[PDB]
Design an enzyme around this catalytic site. Structure first.
Site, PDB file in Angstrom:
ATOM      1  N   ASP A 152       0.777  -1.223   0.000  1.00  0.00           N
ATOM      2  CA  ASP A 152       0.000   0.000   0.000  1.00  0.00           C
ATOM      3  C   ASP A 152       0.819   1.289   0.000  1.00  0.00           C
ATOM      4  OD1 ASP A 152      -2.328  -1.608   0.000  1.00  0.00           O
ATOM      5  OD2 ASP A 152      -2.486  -1.586   2.162  1.00  0.00           O
ATOM      6  N   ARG A 156       0.017   9.262   0.801  1.00  0.00           N
ATOM      7  CA  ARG A 156      -0.803   9.412   2.015  1.00  0.00           C
ATOM      8  C   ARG A 156      -0.384   8.463   3.166  1.00  0.00           C
ATOM      9  NH1 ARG A 156      -4.515   6.069  -0.946  1.00  0.00           N
ATOM     10  NH2 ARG A 156      -4.902   4.230   0.375  1.00  0.00           N
ATOM     11  N   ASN A 157       0.398   7.414   2.858  1.00  0.00           N
ATOM     12  CA  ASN A 157       0.888   6.485   3.885  1.00  0.00           C
ATOM     13  C   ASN A 157       2.305   6.812   4.355  1.00  0.00           C
ATOM     14  OD1 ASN A 157      -1.238   4.794   4.581  1.00  0.00           O
ATOM     15  ND2 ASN A 157      -0.958   3.590   2.691  1.00  0.00           N
ATOM     16  N   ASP A 170       1.592   2.981   7.454  1.00  0.00           N
ATOM     17  CA  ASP A 170       0.431   2.365   6.853  1.00  0.00           C
ATOM     18  C   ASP A 170      -0.777   2.752   7.674  1.00  0.00           C
ATOM     19  OD1 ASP A 170      -1.445   0.676   5.701  1.00  0.00           O
ATOM     20  OD2 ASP A 170      -0.291  -1.168   6.034  1.00  0.00           O
TER      21      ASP A 170
HETATM   22  C1  LIG Z   1       5.066   0.266  12.110  1.00  0.00           C
HETATM   23  C2  LIG Z   1       4.197   0.950  11.059  1.00  0.00           C
HETATM   24  C3  LIG Z   1       4.619   0.612   9.631  1.00  0.00           C
HETATM   25  C4  LIG Z   1       3.831  -0.220   8.841  1.00  0.00           C
HETATM   26  C5  LIG Z   1       4.210  -0.532   7.541  1.00  0.00           C
HETATM   27  C6  LIG Z   1       5.380  -0.021   7.018  1.00  0.00           C
HETATM   28  C7  LIG Z   1       6.173   0.802   7.793  1.00  0.00           C
HETATM   29  C8  LIG Z   1       5.797   1.117   9.092  1.00  0.00           C
HETATM   30  N1  LIG Z   1       2.765   0.630  11.252  1.00  0.00           N
HETATM   31  C9  LIG Z   1       2.363  -0.550  11.835  1.00  0.00           C
HETATM   32  C10 LIG Z   1       1.065  -0.894  12.013  1.00  0.00           C
HETATM   33  C11 LIG Z   1       0.728  -2.191  12.657  1.00  0.00           C
HETATM   34  C12 LIG Z   1       1.432  -2.595  13.796  1.00  0.00           C
HETATM   35  C13 LIG Z   1       1.163  -3.812  14.419  1.00  0.00           C
HETATM   36  C14 LIG Z   1       0.184  -4.663  13.925  1.00  0.00           C
HETATM   37  C15 LIG Z   1      -0.539  -4.303  12.782  1.00  0.00           C
HETATM   38  C16 LIG Z   1      -1.571  -4.868  11.989  1.00  0.00           C
HETATM   39  N2  LIG Z   1      -1.894  -4.072  10.986  1.00  0.00           N
HETATM   40  N3  LIG Z   1      -1.086  -2.975  11.094  1.00  0.00           N
HETATM   41  C17 LIG Z   1      -0.254  -3.070  12.158  1.00  0.00           C
HETATM   42  C18 LIG Z   1       0.038   0.039  11.551  1.00  0.00           C
HETATM   43  O1  LIG Z   1      -1.183  -0.127  11.642  1.00  0.00           O
HETATM   44  N4  LIG Z   1       0.531   1.197  10.972  1.00  0.00           N
HETATM   45  C19 LIG Z   1       1.850   1.548  10.793  1.00  0.00           C
HETATM   46  O2  LIG Z   1       2.186   2.601  10.263  1.00  0.00           O
END
Ligand SMILES: C[C@@H](c1ccccc1)n1cc(-c2cccc3cn[nH]c23)c(=O)[nH]c1=O
Length: 294
Positions: A152, A156-157, A170
């Site tokens: 994704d 915006r992310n 995310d």
């Molecule tokens: C650490 C960061 C991130 C995600 C992706 C790439 C780089 C950074 N992050 C993690 C989550 C998240 C954490 C734990 C469990 C779940 C389950 N779904 N998402 C989770 C989220 O919601 N948002 C977000 O920005």
């Protein structure tokens, strides 16, 4: 949520990710944002000396059944390992007996990158925009090194902290491990597929890889260089595949330098194996950025 039914090895493994009421205060009346996944609240995390850390607390209201909770804990173990200046850290997760699971993230003073660049009151230079793109490439190079497929990636992310450092993040639906589950969940909840950021082979085969994250990165560079214009606004999502199959791509933004648009075209190569790696993108964008004065 029945916490007693979880796999005991998984509970032991996830303990280092769990944070609770002994250190975290969730400010449920102070909403940062509302999304299809739930809400994001302001939160305060206290260390052992009483020092306060400002955080964003993402509530994942759709995680209810045991399989979803187990997958959430597995994802928390994977993301708790993240440590890179261009990747948003996971401070911890909350798995409460009452309420939906929570994701605790560092607070991002300047919000998401798409909102920042689209705001008419802000005036980022072409050099600043390339600099943001280079920061995203470094964060994606780190994630790719962990075999972590974003799926994704979009402006915006990506978030901007108090120092304007870009953090790949995310703010969408709960992250799933399998591509088949990713499609099944979007269909079940109504969540939108990010069609206009997806590689041609992801649209046709329903599979994602680091090479399809490189395609999304190219679209993100185009969002940066247009200050947040919607990609293919005039192309219906259901007509995007044919548009790409005709050899057509996002047109060169007015303020996008030629070498950077050439990087975008390489990101959208029809043959996934011919796209540059995130390491090549960091090298190339650093070279282009080195020629901008300011
Ligand atoms: C650490 C960061 C991130 C995600 C992706 C790439 C780089 C950074 N992050 C993690 C989550 C998240 C954490 C734990 C469990 C779940 C389950 N779904 N998402 C989770 C989220 O919601 N948002 C977000 O920005």
């Amino acid at each position: 949520i029945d916490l007693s039914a979880l796999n005991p090895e998984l509970v032991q493994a996830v303990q280092h990710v769990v944070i609770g009421p002994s250190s975290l205060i969730v400010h449920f009346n102070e909403v940062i944002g509302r999304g299809h996944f739930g809400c994001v609240y302001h939160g305060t995390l206290l260390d052992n000396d009483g020092k306060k850390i400002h955080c964003a607390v993402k509530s994942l209201n759709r995680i209810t059944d045991i399989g979803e909770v187990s997958q959430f804990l597995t994802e928390g173990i994977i993301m708790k390992d993240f440590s890179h200046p261009n990747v948003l850290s996971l401070l911890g997760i909350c798995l409460r007996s009452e309420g939906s699971p929570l994701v605790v993230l560092p607070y991002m003073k300047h919000g998401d990158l798409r909102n920042f660049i689209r705001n008419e009151t802000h005036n980022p230079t072409v050099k600043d925009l390339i600099g943001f793109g280079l920061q995203v490439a470094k964060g994606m190079k780190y994630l790719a090194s962990k075999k972590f497929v974003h799926r994704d990636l979009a402006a915006r992310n990506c978030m901007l902290d108090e120092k304007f450092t870009v953090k790949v993040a995310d703010f969408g639906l709960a992250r799933v491990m399998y591509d088949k589950e990713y499609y099944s969940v979007h269909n079940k909840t109504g969540a939108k597929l990010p069609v206009k950021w997806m590689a041609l082979e992801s649209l046709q085969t329903q599979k994602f890889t680091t090479k399809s994250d490189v395609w999304s990165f190219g679209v993100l560079l185009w969002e940066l260089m247009t200050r947040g214009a919607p990609p293919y606004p005039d192309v219906n999502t259901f007509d995007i595949t044919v548009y790409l199959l005709q050899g057509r791509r996002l047109l060169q933004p007015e303020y996008c330098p030629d070498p950077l648009y050439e990087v975008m075209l390489k990101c959208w190569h029809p043959k996934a194996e011919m796209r540059p790696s995130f390491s090549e993108l960091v090298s190339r964008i650093s070279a282009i950025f080195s020629t901008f004065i300011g």
